Every structure is written in C-alpha cells, then in structure tokens.
C-alpha cells in the first residue's frame, strides 16, 4: 500500500506522544485511530481538513487526498479479505441524529471509500443510543470491548466509530506445562513474579545496532507477524527514538532462524485513551475548536468534535494473541 509507510510513521508519532506522558503499559491500534480520522476528514474543509491528514503523517503535496482515501479503501478491503487461519475484521459505523440535514456526498464517500455502515439514531433516548453503539462495537470485537460508551450527550448530532478485531494462533505455540512464575524487572531494583511462557526452539531473532535491541519475529498462522524489541541495558529510550518504517521493513525481510531459549510473559492489557490533547500536539486542533469546519457533514449549523476516545485490549498466551481496538469520535 502507498499509505503503509505513513501509517507506520503515525504509529511511531502517536507512540512517542503516549510514552512522553509516568510509565504505564501502552497498547493501541494505529490503524483504528488513523482510519476513523481519515474517514472524518471527508466531511471537513480547509485548515480543519489539512491538519487532520497531516497529523496522520501525510504530506498532501506528495500524496493527493484522493490517493490517501483510495489507500484506506484498499487497506480496509485487504484486512477484511477471506482467511481461514487468522481472524481479522475491521469496520466503520456512522451514527446520525434523526433529522440531521446530512450532506449526501459525505454519506456516499464514507460508504464507498471507508466501507462505512450508516445508522439513524435518536440520541435523545440515551440508553437506546448507547446500546446501539455499544452493540456495534461488542459484536465487531467479538465480546472483547463491552460497553465502550458510558455517557452520551442527548444533544449529540453524530458519532463515528471504528473497530478492529484480531485473533491469531502462534505458528509455533508454547506448552502450558512449561509456563512458570519468573521475575520481571519493573526497574533495576524491583521485581514481581509473572507467568513466563518458555520454549527452546528455532526463532527468528536478530541483534540490531541501530536499535541497540534484540529483535524477535513471532509468526502467526496466516498473514500476520508480531515483532518484539528487547532493548539492551539502558537503551529503551534509544530504541523508542530510532524506530522507523524503513528499519521495520528490513527485519521483516530476514527469514533466518537460530536456536534460542525464549522466555515471554503472558499478557493481559487494557487501556482507554483520551487522544484529544496528544493529537493536538501532533497538530490536529481546529477540528476540536469552535472554528472547526465540518461543513461537508452538514451545512445546517456549525459542528465540532468534542471527544476522541480509543480503547484497546490485548491477550497474549501460549496459543497466540487476541486483540481489539475501538475509536469513538463525537
């Protein structure tokens, strides 16, 4: 895809915003966040529009807008394509107030380019409106993200939601009977016991001088791979600073494997992000202001975004990985 390099650089830009905030587990979906905002940009104009796409790491002089949206159209279609060994689904939903005077071109554009579903919602019946949005997300994430929306203004005019769902099996899974409690060094002086999966086997593992890290590629059955970066002592900040899309592509091209004894923890991570302020530091601000130009959505009255909430959940265990994300714009 002509937009995959931009999506990777957006992943790293957003990651670096989140890592600059004390230290916490980070987990998010770059594709979910970017797809929701690119879809929203179809309804925006002028500076409001240019800021969104530039905040997704597109240069509009180098890649015209029509090529950006066709990029997402093909990306989404490919992520959803039939596949027997890997579960992977993604969808967009547009929830519109009854009697919102909708600009038809916006509806036609989001259906064609972002494959969006569209629903008429009475946000005045808040329990039923929340139930529908939460139903869309719960069914999309196969039960992994439940009750995404807890409070929803009864005067809401529209909401835009993206979800993504992933469930893969390891090409070479771990054996549950070999998982044991081992120390995790949360810092140089403190440890906690965690369940550590263990296998002696043939792994795709390399040491990177640019990253000062060991790099492990764990393949899933089907068309996905997880990449793990283990920084050298004192080099976690260096690792975070040096990640680039070109460096990642180089690792994916190496197919070599070597014997190693791998210890990898089971993981269960959940987090909810208010992305308004960090997206602001990536340059996306006018759309959240009273000067927002969303006149491609409706021309009846001025409209702006007030919320940009992302939730993502991750399970890693001996069989594989299950992950889901949702992006909610209102």
């Amino acid at each position, epitope marked *: 895809n002509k937009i995959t390099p931009n999506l990777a650089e957006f992943a790293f830009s957003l990651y670096r915003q989140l890592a600059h905030q004390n230290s916490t587990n980070i987990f998010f979906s770059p594709v979910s966040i970017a797809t929701a905002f690119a879809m929203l940009s179809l309804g925006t104009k002028a500076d409001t529009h240019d800021e969104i796409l530039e905040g997704l790491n597109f240069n509009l002089t180098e890649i015209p807008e029509a090529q950006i949206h066709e990029g997402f159209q093909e990306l989404l279609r490919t992520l959803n394509q039939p596949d027997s060994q890997l579960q992977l689904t993604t969808g967009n939903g547009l929830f519109l107030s009854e009697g919102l005077k909708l600009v038809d071109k916006f*509806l036609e554009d989001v259906k064609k380019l972002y494959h969006s579903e*569209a629903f008429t919602v009475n946000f005045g019946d808040t329990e039923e409106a929340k139930k529908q949005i939460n139903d869309y997300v719960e069914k*999309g994430t196969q039960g992994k993200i439940v009750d995404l929306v807890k409070e929803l203004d009864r005067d809401t005019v529209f909401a835009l939601v993206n979800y993504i769902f992933f469930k893969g099996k390891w090409e070479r899974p771990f054996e549950v009977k070999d998982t044991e409690e081992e120390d995790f060094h949360v810092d140089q002086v403190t440890t906690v016991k965690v369940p550590m999966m263990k296998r002696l086997g043939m792994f795709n593992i390399q040491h990177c001088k640019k990253l000062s890290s060991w790099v492990l590629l764990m393949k899933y059955l089907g068309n996905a791979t997880a990449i793990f970066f283990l920084p050298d002592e004192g080099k976690l900040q260096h690792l975070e600073n040096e990640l680039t899309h070109d460096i990642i592509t180089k690792f994916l091209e190496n197919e070599d494997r070597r014997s190693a004894s791998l210890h990898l923890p089971k993981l269960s991570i959940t987090g909810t992000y208010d992305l308004k302020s960090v997206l602001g530091q990536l340059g996306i601000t006018k759309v959240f202001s009273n000067g927002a130009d969303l006149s491609g959505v409706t021309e009846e009255a001025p409209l702006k975004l007030s919320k940009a909430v992302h939730k993502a959940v991750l399970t890693i265990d001996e069989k594989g990985t299950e992950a889901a994300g949702a992006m909610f714009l209102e």
Partner: antibody
Amino acid sequence: DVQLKQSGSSLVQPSQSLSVTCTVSGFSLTSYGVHWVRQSPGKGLEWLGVIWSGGGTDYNAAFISRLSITKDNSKSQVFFKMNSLQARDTAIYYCARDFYGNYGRYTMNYWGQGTSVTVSS
Amino acid sequence: DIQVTQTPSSLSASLGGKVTITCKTSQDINKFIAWYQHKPGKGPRLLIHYTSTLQPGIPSRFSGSGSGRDYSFSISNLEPEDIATYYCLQYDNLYTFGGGTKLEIKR
C-alpha cells in the same frame, strides 16, 4: 465491507434437493445471524429461516419438514438446503444479514446477490 | 406464524402525487415493522425500521407511522425513480413480509 456472496444459479430436478452457499466477509458469523428469503415469479418476498450467531435456527412454519440451515464460522460460510423441490419452488433465493432494528430486535439488510433456481426436468 | 395483510396489492399513482400503503398484523408487533423497496435485478433496499425511522440517505418523500396492529407507509411527491414494488416486514416475532404493493404510473 460487509459482503454476502452466493453460489451460482442452479437447475434442480423435481423431487430433488437444492443447496446454496452464502459466503460472508467484513463481520463474523459468531456475531450476526444470516437469513434466507425467496421470491417466486409473480409472488412477493417470503422469509424461509435464519441461523443465529450462536448456531440456533428458526424456520418458516410451512417449511419445517423441508429446510436445513447450517454454517461453518471458521470459513464464514452459511449453507441452505431444501428437499423435495417441485415446480412451484422455482424462485430467486437470497441470503441477508441481521441489521440493528432497536431494543434488541434485528431486521434484514445487506442482501446477497440472489441465486436463481429453476425446478424442471 | 404472525400474519401480515398489506394493501393494496397494486396501485397506479400520478407523478407528484401521494401514495399510502397499509400493513395490518394478526397480533401486536410493538412497532417492529420495516419497509423495503424492491426493483428488478436489485437487492431489496431498507427504507424504514421501527415503524417510522428512515435510513440515512432515504429521501424525505418516504414516511411511516402506526402502532399495535395497524401500520402505514407513504410516498409523497412520487418520482419516476420511486416506481417499484414495496414490502412491509414485521420483525417482532420471527419475520413475515407483507404481500407487496406494485406501484405503477398513472397516465
């Protein structure tokens, strides 16, 4: 990116059985039900049955002894089978998907392209 | 097992006029009725669900009302692109289509 795609149009001999496959993408069959509907020449739409996300089924009462709907979640396929076809079963057969219809009820949307079936020797 | 009586089964309407179709059910369906447009060689197109809720992009020409066992559907300002067959669907207790209304142009 919600899609329902049906197998090709068939010629069925009288008293023999009809099989149609609906292959879906852009959603999981563990999340939504898939319906089957026919339209005979000069007649209206007629609902035939549904296979729910959990695997349970419901059928039009006039067809209970004739119909079977099964599925394979992992292949995203739904399978429609009807036995003992006669001339009056010539029709276009459609699959369609649950669509949020408020308060926990679902109507039909996202129709397959239809499978024309002619019953004739 | 819920029976649905849709009337009339055929209707000649004038361009720019108004048409009204009714659906009566054999028991209370609690406003779970939807309305579809069907043109030859096309999939049925959802116009309205829960009695009166239009889908995004459906023209204001279309409207629905009712409750209990008695529902109605109307097309105002009839246009040539509206010439089609129309169906109600109860979805309160399984699913039952009305018999359809084939709309034709008066001349």
